[PDB]
Ligand binder design. Structure first.
Ligand SMILES: [Mg+2]
Ligand SMILES: [Mg+2]
Ligand SMILES: [Mg+2]
Ligand SMILES: [Mg+2]
Ligand SMILES: [Mg+2]
Ligand SMILES: [Mg+2]
Ligand SMILES: [Mg+2]
Ligand SMILES: [Mg+2]
Ligand SMILES: [Mg+2]
Ligand SMILES: [Mg+2]
Ligand SMILES: [Zn+2]
Lengths: 71, 129, 101, 132, 217, 83, 221, 25
RNA sequence: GGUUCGAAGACGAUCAGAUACCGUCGUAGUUCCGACCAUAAACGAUGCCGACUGGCGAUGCGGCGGCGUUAUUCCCAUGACCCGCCGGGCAGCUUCCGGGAAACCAAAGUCUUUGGGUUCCGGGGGGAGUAUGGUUGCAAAGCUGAAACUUAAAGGAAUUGA
């Protein structure tokens, strides 16, 4: 803490609110932008219909075809 | 500007005790400073001192022993009940055998162990050990 | 990494020092940062001094000097070998090289 | 490039301190001295040791050599160190004294010694080097 | 001294001090030595109070006597002015001399051949002998040093104010330091002058040696 | 350090500087303990009595080791009061 | 095999003339031979290798790999040592680190929490040690708490005889080198801390170098 | 790609975007 | 108003190319007056106010004191040197004060022995000082300022090599 007066509780409290929004994990849980970008909508599981069967390459050091499904 | 004279007095004593001197000159004087050192006096941490009387805020010359580890001030002067006193001394004292929290009550400026002995809360001023 | 305590110059409490011009190139350098030579030499150098001395119409003519002051940017100063880099602790001394000859 | 290595210099410096009296000034005699007094396993460094020993002789003859101590030369070092004069350099009938220490002595119980002579202090406090 | 008349400095010692110029210090004065100084000249040289020189000299003598074994009191002088005085001080008192170059590690490197661990160092100058004083910081032993008006008092325990750069003054200070340790240990009586001449402790540079050799011969 | 019954449970009692009254540590290899000999009043010769002073390494490195010795000496009469 | 002392303090110890290394701690003497320690604590000293750390330097042809060993030793009441030795082979690094660990053993002050009944068990007060970025704090704890700490400062404490203590670590504690010897820093200064039970003026004891000068002069010169 | 020239590129691109925007507004 | 210099441009070189570095010429500008703009590695990459904690030699201003030189001359006193002391100021050297990841810093110390007062401000790297909205400006642009998405590193001080 920088300011240390007895009557500075409004100063200290309202400074936490501003600086908590620069916390990345706080930023996404308390905004609706992250929740609406989630395909699940905030659920742990979801059901869907298989559209096609696809395989992706892996990455630079590895080399394998990753069996995936587009749902 | 100068805001808390007791904060300056104890910081000055702590630097000169840390460097091994024998006497310290405390530039501003007040009843709070004189009453605070007399508490440190009664427990043998400092020697006897002397206040110089110019017609302004006087000076003080304090004889030092080698027994003081740290003296400090708590800002702001929080109010402390008897319920909060065990938690405060848990935070800012080294052990449970020695060390003292000086806190002013309506009964006067006086340290924590006996402030509990006459069942009075107060406002915390500082600590020494 | 802070290489030099004073930042290669002599500006302490100014904020701005006027710039000068290098002599080798035309690089614009602050006056306090530039490396300054002050060379004082005779007109005739060392081997013609006898030739003009015998050809002079005067007796015991003291040959004139040539006072010109030089300014160098850091680039020209290094490339002309008027100053050279030194070891890290040797950078700290600032007495000029010996002036016997 | 005729620089003598350590194994020649070290051997010669040991030989000179232990057999100074027997050694000479010519290369050929003390070459025989070195051969019989130390077991040197070949001729070439026997010659190189003997050659350095001869070179060390001339240095020793002129004066002392730091790394080696022949018995004679320090015997006169301790004779030089033991030397003492006949009258003391600390015994004078006039001790030159400036004014200020006369007051320093006056504060001491030595207010006036027998043989102190006061001088006039130098006027002009010009005792610093010019700054440049 | 303890204000004892037997230990008080006398007239025949003061003249020896004044002849050697021990009172004369230098042009500089560090804050650690400012209470060993009387005052300053118009010449720029400081006067060393001889009262405090003597008392500090006697205090150093007390510490040397307390060492029962004289062999583990080490004496060092790197500059050539005090090498002869060190060779003579050890002869009279029985100390172990170290004259010349001090090889770093004599006090801390037990594997070395010249590993010696004394109980007391007497040093001719803290500035020229910075190395032995630093070594004394690694093993617990006090240090005694002759200190001029400018020498720093790092790691020094009994600073004896004197003129530790003059040829005579260094010899005189080592001579009567040896005298007082002998008088206090009982080897010598205080009623007679000591037979050892002070000039036996002065350093004699090569130039003046041949001058007296041809003069004597 | 005693417990409730009064027994000394401390493993040893460490030394403590005579000039600054701080504890000399078990690895303080810059600390000293200097003995100063005692003379008798009439002859001025070594009796066999000492005065012992301890100095922590902080004071020696500070350069105040001799001044501390000087005052502790005149505190016990070894050095003349006038000085 | 037989130990031939080359130090002055070593000769006295072998002659069975110093009652305990606790006596030589009182005078802060430098123990420079490894055999004074195991003479006094040899049966009770346990050693444990904290880890093996392979530092390496890159030369013209490849890398030069040297193994560095951290070894912590100490009897389980009042003594702890920590030594570090780097050598080209792991076996010699361990042997050389134990020798360095033995020379650095420091005694441990242990006190009480609350009331002072029984043997001391905890740290006497709050002590802090530092090296590098590691800050380590030891807080006194009630009896039976145990040691609550990271694994590597815990084993130093169990061989200190401290059987309960609260800790707190700041900095890059994953650097086991600093984090080991920051605990050992806090343990060291538990005698350096002046407590109101140490206000009695010290009665000076006459030193072993001065006490035993006569046997010292005789036995070896 | 030093930041000074990157910023200059960004300014030119932004100016083009703006012009294309009031062309449509 | 336009001497010099010189964005753009023109030509001559060089070059594999050379819309550049080199050379010659040269526009806007560079100068002044009156209005806008509000950004710089606008840096000490280091908020302000206050207290305390080592020395040493300097330098600038003012003040105080002191041997002695040198002018006015006709001595007082003012100037110029010299020797110190005090208060602010720009810095410097040294240091196991202490701190720091270190480089280093008498502050970047008096911090797990954590609280002198108070302001601004950072929360892995990118996207991005970008989109949009608002506001200021003649314009150039300034201020305020996201997200989707992407990625296990990006980075600081020091060490050994090449
Ligand atoms: Mg660079
Ligand atoms: Mg600027
Ligand atoms: Mg072209
Ligand atoms: Mg042109
Ligand atoms: Mg900006
Ligand atoms: Mg900035
Ligand atoms: Mg904090
Ligand atoms: Mg971020
Ligand atoms: Mg990866
Ligand atoms: Mg950067
Ligand atoms: Zn240039």
């Amino acid at each position: 803490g920088k300011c240390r007066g007895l009557r500075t509780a409004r100063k200290l409290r309202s400074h936490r609110r501003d600086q908590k929004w620069h916390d990345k994990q706080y930023k996404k849980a308390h905004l609706g932008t992250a929740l609406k970008a989630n395909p699940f909508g905030g659920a742990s599981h979801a059901k869907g219909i298989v559209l096609e069967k696809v395989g992706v390459e892996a990455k630079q050091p590895n080399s394998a075809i990753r069996k995936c499904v587009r749902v | 500007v100068r805001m808390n004279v007791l904060a300056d007095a104890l910081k000055s004593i702590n630097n000169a005790e840390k460097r091994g001197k024998r006497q310290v000159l405390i530039r501003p004087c007040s009843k709070v400073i004189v009453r605070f050192l007399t508490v440190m006096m009664k427990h043998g941490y400092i020697g006897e001192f002397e206040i110089i009387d110019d017609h302004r805020a006087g000076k003080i010359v304090v004889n030092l022993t080698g027994r003081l580890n740290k003296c400090g001030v708590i800002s702001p002067r929080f109010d402390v009940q008897l319920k909060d006193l065990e938690k405060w001394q848990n935070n800012l004292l080294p052990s449970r055998q020695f060390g003292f929290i000086v806190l002013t009550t309506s009964a006067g400026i006086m340290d924590h162990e006996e402030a509990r002995r006459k069942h009075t809360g107060g406002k915390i001023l500082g600590f020494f050990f | 990494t802070k290489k030099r305590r004073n930042n290669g110059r002599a500006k302490k409490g100014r904020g701005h020092v006027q710039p000068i011009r290098c002599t080798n190139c035309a690089r614009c350098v602050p006056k306090d940062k530039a490396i300054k030579k002050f060379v004082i030499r005779n007109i005739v150098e060392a081997a013609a001094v006898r030739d003009i001395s015998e050809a002079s119409v005067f007796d015991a003519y003291v040959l004139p000097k040539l006072y010109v002051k030089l300014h160098y940017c850091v680039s020209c100063a290094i490339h002309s070998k008027v100053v050279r880099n030194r070891s890290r602790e040797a950078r700290k001394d600032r007495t000029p090289p010996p002036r016997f000859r | 490039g005729r620089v003598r290595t350590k194994t020649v210099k070290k051997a010669a410096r040991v030989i000179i301190e232990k057999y100074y009296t027997r050694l000479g000034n010519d290369f050929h005699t003390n070459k025989r001295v070195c051969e019989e007094i130390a077991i040197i396993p070949s001729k070439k460094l026997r010659n190189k040791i003997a050659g350095y020993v001869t070179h060390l002789m001339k240095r020793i003859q002129r004066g002392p050599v730091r790394g080696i101590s022949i018995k004679l030369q320090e015997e006169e070092r301790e004779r030089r160190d033991n030397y003492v004069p006949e009258v003391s350099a600390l015994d004078q009938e006039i001790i030159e004294v400036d004014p200020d220490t006369k007051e320093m002595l006056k504060l001491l119980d030595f207010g006036s010694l027998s043989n102190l002579q006061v001088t006039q202090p130098t006027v002009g406090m010009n005792f610093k080097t010019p700054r440049g | 001294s303890g204000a004892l008349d037997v230990l008080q400095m006398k007239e025949e010692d003061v003249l020896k001090f004044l002849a050697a110029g021990t009172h004369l210090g230098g042009t500089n004065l560090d804050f650690q030595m400012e209470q060993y100084i009387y005052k300053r000249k118009s010449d720029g040289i400081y006067i060393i109070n001889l009262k405090r020189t003597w008392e500090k000299l006697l205090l150093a003598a007390r510490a040397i006597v307390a060492i029962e074994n004289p062999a583990d009191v080490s004496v060092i002088s790197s500059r050539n002015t005090g090498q002869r005085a060190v060779l003579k001080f050890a002869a009279a008192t029985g100390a172990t001399p170290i004259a010349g170059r001090f090889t770093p590690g004599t006090f801390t490197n037990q594997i070395q051949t010249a590993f010696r661990e004394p109980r007391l160092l007497v040093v001719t100058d803290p500035r020229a002998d910075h190395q032995p004083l630093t070594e004394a910081s690694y093993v617990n032993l006090p240090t005694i040093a002759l200190c001029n008006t400018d020498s720093p008092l790092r790691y020094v325990d009994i600073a004896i104010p004197c003129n530790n750069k003059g040829a005579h003054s260094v010899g005189l200070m080592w001579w009567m330091l040896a005298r007082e340790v002998l008088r206090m240990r009982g080897t010598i009586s205080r009623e007679h002058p000591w037979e050892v001449m002070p000039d036996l402790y002065f350093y004699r540079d090569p130039e003046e040696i041949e001058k007296e050799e041809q003069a004597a011969a | 350090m005693q417990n409730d019954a009064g027994e000394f449970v401390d493993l040893y009692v460490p030394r403590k500087c005579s000039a600054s009254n701080r504890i000399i540590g078990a690895k303080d290899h810059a600390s000293i303990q200097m003995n100063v000999a005692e003379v008798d009043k009439v002859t001025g010769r070594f009796n066999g009595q000492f005065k012992t002073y301890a100095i922590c390494g902080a004071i020696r490195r500070m350069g105040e080791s001799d001044d501390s010795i000087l005052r502790l000496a005149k505190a016990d009469g070894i050095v003349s009061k006038n000085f | 095999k037989e130990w031939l002392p080359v130090t002055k303090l070593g000769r006295l110890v072998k002659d069975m003339k110093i009652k305990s290394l606790e006596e030589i701690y009182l005078f802060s003497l430098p123990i420079k031979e490894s055999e004074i320690i195991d003479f006094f604590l040899g049966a009770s000293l346990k050693d444990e290798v904290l880890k093996i750390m392979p530092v390496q330097k890159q030369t013209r042809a490849g890398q030069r790999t040297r193994f560095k060993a951290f070894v912590a030793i100490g009897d389980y009441n009042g003594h702890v040592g920590l030594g570090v030795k780097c050598s080209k082979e792991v076996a010699t690094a361990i042997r050389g680190a134990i020798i360095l660990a033995k020379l650095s053993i420091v005694p441990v002050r242990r006190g009480y929490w609350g009331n002072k009944i029984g043997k001391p068990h905890t740290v006497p007060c709050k002590v802090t040690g530092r090296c590098g970025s590691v800050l380590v704090r030891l807080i006194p704890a009630p009896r039976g708490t145990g040691i609550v700490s990271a694994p590597v400062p815990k084993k130093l404490l169990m061989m200190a005889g401290i059987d309960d203590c609260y800790t707190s670590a700041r900095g890059c504690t994953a650097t086991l080198g600093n984090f080991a010897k920051a605990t050992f820093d806090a343990i060291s200064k538990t005698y350096s801390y002046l407590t109101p039970d140490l206000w009695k003026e010290t009665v000076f004891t006459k030193s072993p170098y001065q006490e035993f000068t006569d046997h010292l002069v005789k036995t070896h010169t | 790609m030093r930041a000074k020239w990157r910023k200059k590129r960004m300014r030119r691109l932004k100016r083009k975007r703006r012009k294309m925007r009031q062309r449509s507004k």
